[PDB]
Structure 1
Amino acid sequence: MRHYEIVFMVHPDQSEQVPGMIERYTAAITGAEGKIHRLEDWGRRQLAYPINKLHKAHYVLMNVEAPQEVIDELETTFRFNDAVIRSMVMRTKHAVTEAS
């Protein structure tokens, strides 16, 4: 399977939406035997400029190794939420743990 980060922002005052998607996502990726290398949470982080007065991220990444037609379920579910920004899949460059 192709390598992908699967990274998404989510505003910290909206963090209740994350267990409402990631607990369904991890079961879909284990159903696809995806490795889920990272599954890491970065506390709270700032953005490079404020966007519609929201300037903060809850910031989580999975690093999945998963099929193109399984990440389509993630792509369409982030697009279904829409209030989540910069939901990116960041292909290739092999697996990552601790990032040096």
Structure 2
Amino acid sequence: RTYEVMYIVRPNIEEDAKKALVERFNGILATEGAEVLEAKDWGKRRLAYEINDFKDGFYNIVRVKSDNNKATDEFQRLAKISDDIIRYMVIRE
């Protein structure tokens, strides 16, 4: 079963911090027997509306395949806890 995870990181993130964060969350999406088919970055994009008072956001796309959704659930829980990721969504197909 495939999953596309899109998330937005706050526009005021330093390069090194952003790299660390994306590495951490890709590892999270990879942990629970889920293979990250491919991760990529769409750069910093203008948001159609202010989210948490931010007009811009770094857009990260990840596609991961798994037979369950433990990795996606952990990603969503840690993204909710995180104050660096603004938005996230998971689509099955």
| TM bracket (short chain) | 0.7 to 0.9
More strand by share: 2
Q: Name the larger-Rg structure.
A: 1
Cα RMSD for the two superposed structures: 2.3
1:4 is displaced (CA, Å) by 1.0
Gaps of 5+ in 1: 94-100
CA change 1:53–1:27 in 2 (3 A) is closer
Could you state the TM-score of these two structures normalised by the residue count of structure 2? 0.75
The percentage of aligned residue pairs carrying the same residue is: 30
What residue number does 2:24 align with?
24
> 1:1-100 counterparts in 2 under 5 A?
2-15=1-14, 17-28=17-28, 29=30, 32-37=33-38, 39-66=39-66, 67-91=68-92, 93=93
* Count, aligned residues: 90
Q: For 2:70 and 2:32, locate their aligned partners in 1 and report how far apart those are by CA, in whole Å.
A: 13
